[PDB]
Design a protein around this ligand. Sequence first.
Ligand SMILES: C[S@@+](CC[C@H](N)C(=O)[O-])C[C@H]1O[C@@H](n2cnc3c(N)ncnc32)[C@H](O)[C@@H]1O
Ligand SMILES: [Zn+2]
Lengths: 305, 408, 188, 107, 73
Amino acid sequence: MLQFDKQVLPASGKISTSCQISPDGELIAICQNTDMLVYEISSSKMMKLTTTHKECINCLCWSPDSKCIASGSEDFTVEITHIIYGRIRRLMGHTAPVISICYNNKGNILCSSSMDESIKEWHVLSGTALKTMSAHSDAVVSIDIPKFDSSILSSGSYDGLIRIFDTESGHCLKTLTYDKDWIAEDGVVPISTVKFSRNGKFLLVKSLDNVVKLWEYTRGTVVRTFLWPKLKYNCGLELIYPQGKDPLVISGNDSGSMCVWNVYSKNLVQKIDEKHRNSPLISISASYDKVATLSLNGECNLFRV
Amino acid sequence: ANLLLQDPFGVLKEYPEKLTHTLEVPVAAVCVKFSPRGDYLAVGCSNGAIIIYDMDSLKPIAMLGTHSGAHTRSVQSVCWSNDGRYLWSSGRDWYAKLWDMTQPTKCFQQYKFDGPLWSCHVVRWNVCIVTVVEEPTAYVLTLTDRQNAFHCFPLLEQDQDISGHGYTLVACPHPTIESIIITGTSKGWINAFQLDLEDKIRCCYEEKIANANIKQIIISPSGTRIAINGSDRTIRQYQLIVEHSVSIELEHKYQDIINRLQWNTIFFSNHSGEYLVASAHGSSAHDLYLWETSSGSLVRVLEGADEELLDIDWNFYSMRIASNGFESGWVYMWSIVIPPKWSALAPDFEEVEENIDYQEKENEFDIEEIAIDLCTPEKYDVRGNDISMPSFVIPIDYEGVIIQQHWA
Amino acid sequence: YQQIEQNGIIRDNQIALNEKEFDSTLASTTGSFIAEGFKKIPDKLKSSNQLTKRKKPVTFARSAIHNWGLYALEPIAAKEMIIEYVGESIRQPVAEMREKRYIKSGIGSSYLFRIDENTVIDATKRGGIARFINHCCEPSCTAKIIKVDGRKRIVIYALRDIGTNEELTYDYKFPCLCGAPSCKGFLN
Amino acid sequence: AKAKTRSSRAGLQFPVGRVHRLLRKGNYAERVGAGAPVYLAAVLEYLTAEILELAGNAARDNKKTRIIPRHLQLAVRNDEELNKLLGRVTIAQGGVLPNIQSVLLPK
Amino acid sequence: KLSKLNEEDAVIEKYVNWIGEVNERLSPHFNQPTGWITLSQNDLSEQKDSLENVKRRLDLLISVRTNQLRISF
Ligand SMILES: C[S@@+](CC[C@H](N)C(=O)[O-])C[C@H]1O[C@@H](n2cnc3c(N)ncnc32)[C@H](O)[C@@H]1O
Ligand SMILES: [Zn+2]
């Protein structure tokens, strides 16, 4: 069903924020503190790639064809770098820092988050301010474009907004939960990470209460809930895909406890708790069959069906 | 396509009404053709460029005509493939360049013609019927297993004369058969040509409807309706009966009674062609027209422009009308607007258009495991298109993207 | 060490050329983002059917006064209707319960209106876009009650020439968070 | 839609019968064409619709149902296009547009 | 070896030689009748080859990325 293959990185060291594999299935980018390591899984080599960021890198993104790597950090840099050719464009357009980003599924629009209740858009060749999405009430964590088609933009934010926008003109189109008001008494938990599925018809959330739900965005309610039988972290979510029937979801806890939920029924078959036992976990991403992990301490564990 | 799943209450139109973009292209154009999706607009430019536009930010991504095969004179018509991978481009520099966007600046195979052209039309992505000027046959050029042998297949039987009919000026392939090619002469007559994809052809249908220079023949995408634009002031939509064996009959006639203008280009609706557009020729005609193709009446007018509009294109996904205003050169564009909705601020608002008299109930004074699938893509959009074919994305130029800060 | 020193000048004075990205007021952002400090603080650093044919293209956006407000998308002249007020129609006893029931849960906005003294126009769940404009004691809109064919719609005109994206006001006439000085410091 | 009463064939509310009479025994030209009273009755529909849209519009502001002539001058002089069309004209018992020159307003 | 740069210096030099030993023979393709809408190919010796002589502005710009890179470690 799922087993462990290999771990090559040591635990301790610098600030590690995001682990990201390109969607080809082979080329991994590990965000260290102002550094990116490249780990080719085929022949098991390493490569270091440093970029012209100043501060602690939060955004990292991969190309759909693995030809360019865009990042983003909190000195207002909006940076897209090449795999060997260097820095390509620097947009420097938000008046607030940036947490996470994604790509258009053609590769022309890297999307972008600003923490002063606005979300903006950049073209690579134009380099200008395309659109303004000003509909938010808090700092925005993750904006996940779905995997297959680049139509809709789901937003995640620190007030509790499962809010879904437009890419074609940039207007609000769906909101699944309420904002700080409508109970106004701390009833709405803040949201850490919103994610789409492979199809893009199902939306996934991990909240600040460390409760995972799989939203149907279309109808307006939820069809799944995944408990942990309080968090102070921005941890990531992933849906690993085996070739069999059930793709398990995965998120990380305050510490190295990582259950995986069956999503078809709701039971809990596997859990990878053998690693990360000191290390508090921010980011996870996958490949066709190679899923990585990361924490404050940079442990990249690979796995296999 | 998930934006149209969230945009309306559930009502979406069947023609655009307003015009929301305008491509500021100062060098003028001749033809505008979209991709087989709504993403890419090929622009047939006047001097000999092709300035291909990404239809999300109104600023280009490439230019076909940098490395090899740039058009010296004007470029006349263009089509695209089934998937949007190639480009077949007919021009007035006596050259039909099949381009491929895998190498998005270089041609693949050209042909030095005997003179200029009018149009091009593809049946498969390689084979392309071209209209050589002053030629009473259509030398359809096919890219064969080798690229060099452009077999100049004469689209005429060896005995048949169109003497007294002039040259062939239009050839448009059938959508649903993919092997019978409807062509129209320079004087009146209409032929059919069943290519065997060997090279036997049958002149199954011949006729004459009215003596004019047939500027354009279109077929509806359901293969039912076929409209003919003469050099006089009429549009004859006909009904198509192909089981081969072909015969047409007169459905409707569309004219401008007031000014008596010529119709430059005509184009049909998406599913069965329930709406016919046209662009008039003379000045002060500043607007595309629409017609209900059954009743016949002028039902709507795309009143957005200021000039005379020459060519037209209707991609059915984005529901846009691209058209070069011929005088200035700018590409006018229409789009179905979607107004914003405050109903998506909280998960329960409602936008009722009237002050509703809600009845007073009793409640006002009182104090899962569904089936889950993650693997399949979408199959049909709200428009009901051929979707679940993941299209040929045009890759951006990842050969010289690092240069593009310095000097084009 | 010889590699990194020659790569030092690639990031010592060439980090002084590239890092010119200061454009804000240089807020307190020296706290690390691996800490994930919450900072739950209200800090604002940004710059802050019959009568349908007759309305104006005003949009709602994030307000310069409050959470949400309307932005007039054209230079409106003196006395033209901006938006007909649309919503529910419910009388005084049933709106007496809803006046507290929403604030029992605690929404915190007075989304009713008055046509005559018996009945209100609710705008919490239903409504038009006409509800979104907020209070300022200096007026730029009023709402006369006109009658259309036996039943009274409520229609919000202008007083003065509102400009492009000039945020509209409304008096309510039963604090003042407009930021205006020439005002009473409360609502009442 | 119908066959009789040419206005109903055109979809107007103004008569095309009367307009085709008044282009012959008004002696405007020798031979009035058949499309000509149709086009003219549509324009006189539209300008009457443009006024009576704006007339009852400013009837609603006054709060009265019916339209008095005072509402017609307020519909004509407030609108620039109509004002240009009706530049020379005086609408009888119709008042003026309420304006003061703003030098005369107090300090 | 130098397998990360020489792919460019194969294709920077492809402009010099592989474009060179094929597109040099366009100038003796004027030479068929004797040493204008018939055969308007005379200006494309310096208008379609205008970018070819301005390709030297960019082909060394591809050839100085490793001048930035080999000094960067
Ligand atoms: C009649 S509703 C206005 C519509 C609401 N602000 C909206 O956009 O959804 C009353 C709300 O306006 C706000 N408000 C009332 N008086 C205000 C004032 N003088 N300045 C700013 N906001 C005010 C209050 O917070 C209250 O929630
Ligand atoms: Zn105030």
